[PDB]
Amino acid sequence: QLDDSFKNLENKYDGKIGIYTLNTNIKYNESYHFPICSVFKFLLVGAILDYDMHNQGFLDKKIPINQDDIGKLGYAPITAKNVGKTLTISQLNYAAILSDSPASNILVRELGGLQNLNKFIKKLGDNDTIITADEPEINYTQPHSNINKTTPKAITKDIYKLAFGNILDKKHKDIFIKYLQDNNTGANRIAFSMPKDWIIGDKTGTCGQYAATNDVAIIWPKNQQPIALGILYTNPNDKNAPSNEEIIQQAAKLIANDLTNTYK
């Protein structure tokens, strides 16, 4: 019946919705591949934190922000205010989680490139996520290729493992969690449907094609242990279809209702 409800959303809006939750189990199309879009930025920040663990002091390292870092990238809320100055790696992490594109490309470079990122993703246990570019090329996919795509299961296990698992230590988990909680781009996605006393941190993704609209979250239900929730949406049949936040809202509400029933 949760299944029936998710199917109704697909009928209503076209395309495919993918859902996975992880407890300390609601799932739908959890092994279907969806454009990852900007969601990759939380994997990147995870990789940076792991790097810091192996390279003490890295988070405090000062990075020059140059005009060519910005380039023709339009969404640069933090980096654009710092051209000709420097930002620490940690400040760039914050920016990346807030979806700052130049910040993300800088981090990929300072990590040592995409090969290192993909190595880290494999270390997480994720063999479904395939990243072959940074911003903005990461946003371009093809319907039948898994390049630059992930699955609800893989990406949701990833965020849970990073925030609560055994790859980052306590100090670095707490930092990761705080970045996600500071994010402001998902107000109209999962957060929109959570009870107001539930705490959430999240990373969104919006490709600008194939209606690709994502939100992957950690949620602390009142008086319960934290859970992870990934909701991915795409219409592989319409390259020009615009993003759709409402379907995420409705899927998240179904889930919130079910969880509340569970905890009751």
Side-chain angles (χ1 to χ4, degrees):
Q1 254 143 99
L2 286 185
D3 178 312
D4 295 319
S5 284
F6 296 138
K7 180 66 179 190
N8 289 340
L9 298 178
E10 283 170 343
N11 289 336
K12 185 174 172 195
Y13 290 116
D14 303 326
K16 291 264 166 194
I17 191 122
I19 304 306
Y20 198 75
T21 66
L22 238 199
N23 261 93
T24 57
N25 207 270
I26 312 172
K27 56 189 174 172
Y28 184 86
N29 279 329
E30 73 277 8
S31 285
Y32 193 87
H33 288 251
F34 292 80
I36 192 176
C37 314
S38 281
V39 175
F40 90 97
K41 292 162 183 175
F42 87 73
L43 296 174
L44 173 58
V45 164
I48 291 286
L49 293 168
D50 169 269
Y51 191 90
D52 179 75
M53 285 174 61
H54 300 72
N55 296 268
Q56 185 282 335
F58 189 64
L59 284 176
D60 297 304
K61 169 167 281 188
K62 295 169 193 185
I63 311 303
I65 305 311
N66 303 315
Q67 192 60 240
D68 56 37
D69 283 325
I70 304 309
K72 296 182 184 167
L73 296 167
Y75 195 73
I78 294 75
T79 54
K81 307 192 176 188
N82 289 277
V83 173
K85 305 174 168 191
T86 64
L87 286 179
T88 66
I89 289 288
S90 188
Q91 287 175 314
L92 288 155
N93 283 342
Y94 165 88
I97 294 303
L98 266 65
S99 222
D100 191 301
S101 295
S104 298
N105 286 356
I106 290 169
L107 289 174
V108 164
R109 185 190 68 220
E110 300 300 326
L111 186 70
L114 290 174
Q115 293 184 107
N116 284 340
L117 177 55
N118 289 309
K119 288 194 285 181
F120 178 75
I121 294 175
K122 280 147 196 161
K123 186 182 176 177
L124 276 181
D126 184 343
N127 304 118
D128 289 332
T129 296
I130 308 293
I131 294 166
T132 60
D134 58 21
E135 287 278 337
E137 182 173 18
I138 179 74
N139 292 310
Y140 319 139
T141 56
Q142 305 292 346
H144 298 318
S145 171
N146 298 330
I147 300 304
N148 299 335
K149 293 191 185 167
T150 183
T151 60
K153 187 178 177 181
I155 200 66
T156 299
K157 289 195 314 167
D158 287 345
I159 201 169
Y160 187 88
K161 183 159 180 58
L162 284 168
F164 306 115
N166 57 20
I167 53 125
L168 297 185
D169 60 18
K170 182 183 194 306
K171 184 164 85 60
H172 292 81
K173 288 190 275 204
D174 287 343
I175 289 169
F176 180 74
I177 283 167
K178 184 56 161 66
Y179 292 140
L180 289 176
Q181 293 179 339
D182 283 348
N183 177 225
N184 55 9
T185 65
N188 287 295
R189 297 180 187 192
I190 289 170
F192 184 93
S193 299
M194 282 320 97
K196 304 172 185 188
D197 48 318
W198 292 17
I199 303 171
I200 170 176
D202 79 296
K203 177 75 195 81
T204 58
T206 316
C207 282
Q209 54 162 41
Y210 296 111
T213 316
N214 304 333
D215 195 12
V216 183
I218 300 298
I219 303 172
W220 290 260
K222 193 178 184 185
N223 299 331
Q224 300 288 337
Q225 287 185 49
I227 54 152
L229 167 61
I231 304 176
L232 316 179
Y233 172 73
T234 193
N235 180 350
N237 302 292
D238 197 343
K239 185 172 188 177
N240 293 328
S243 66
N244 181 344
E245 294 190 303
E246 329 253 316
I247 198 179
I248 311 295
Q249 298 171 357
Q250 291 162 47
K253 180 51 151 291
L254 288 169
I255 291 159
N257 288 345
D258 199 48
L259 289 180
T260 292
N261 191 33
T262 290
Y263 298 143
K264 180 172 196 183

